[PDB]
Amino acid sequence: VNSFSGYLKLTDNVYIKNADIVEEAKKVKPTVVVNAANVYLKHGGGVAGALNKATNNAMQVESDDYIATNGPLKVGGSCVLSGHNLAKHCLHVVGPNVNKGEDIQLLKSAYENFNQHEVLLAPLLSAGIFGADPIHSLRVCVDTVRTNVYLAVFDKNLYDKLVSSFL
Ligand SMILES: CC(=O)Nc1ccc(C(=O)O)cc1
């Protein structure tokens, strides 16, 4: 038993809810919140801008030190940093950005990072301003992630379409 409430069960291990990933993290304080990162960990908009704003920019300060030391992530890759006031840890995962021409086949590699963590609160990778089809992103999630993932879909209209079209 865990602290997640109000989720619809899609599979043995995947759950979904219409919720803002920021408000959900603040309420649950999960072990792991996933950020929809880019390779530079420049948290400007969407999940990353919203998560970073909720940390009063501490996520960005930590991220800049990480990049100064390690260089950029790979598309499909991840790093574990602090969760600040939102979670124990933040798993920053880079899905391909369709609006930059990145290979959508890298979405499966991106979701494979989630398997290193027993439970996660996450957004749909490569959705929203990353330009991928969210229905596709949910299918890859279900077919790739084997650990317990609690998906927060911000858009109510999209949430209803994801549920009603789910195979
Ligand atoms: C404030 C705010 O922008 N929140 C969010 C939450 C989730 C997403 C997303 O999943 O794309 C985008 C934006």
**Which two tokens mark 83?**
């969760």
At residue 155, the 3 state secondary structure works out as coil
User: What whole-number distance in Å separates Cα of residue 11 and Cα of residue 14?
Assistant: 5
Cα 138 to the chain's mean position, in Å? Answer: 12
Q: Are 130 and 36 in contact (CB under 8 A)?
A: yes
Which two three-digit tokens encode residue 165? Answer: 């079209």
- The residue extents of the domains of the chain are 1-167
Q: How many whole angstroms separate alpha carbon 40 and alpha carbon 2?
A: 33
Q: Determination technique for this PDB entry?
A: X-ray
Please check whether residue 111 is in contact with residue 75, taking contact to mean a CB–CB distance below 8 angstroms: no
Measured between alpha carbons, how far is 60 from 67 in angstroms, rounded to an integer?
10
Return the residue whose CA atom lies nearest to atom 3 of ligand 1.
Answer: 46
Q: Of ligand 1's atoms, which has the minimum distance to the CA of residue 49?
A: 3
In three-state secondary structure terms, 90 is strand
SS3 of residue 131 by DSSP: coil
β-strand pairing of 119-122 with 8-9: unpaired
The rounded Å distance from CA 74 to ligand 1 centre is 22
Residue tagged 């300060």 (tokens): 61
Q: How far is CA 1 from the centre of its chain?
A: 22
Report the atom number in ligand 1 closest to the C-alpha of 20. 6
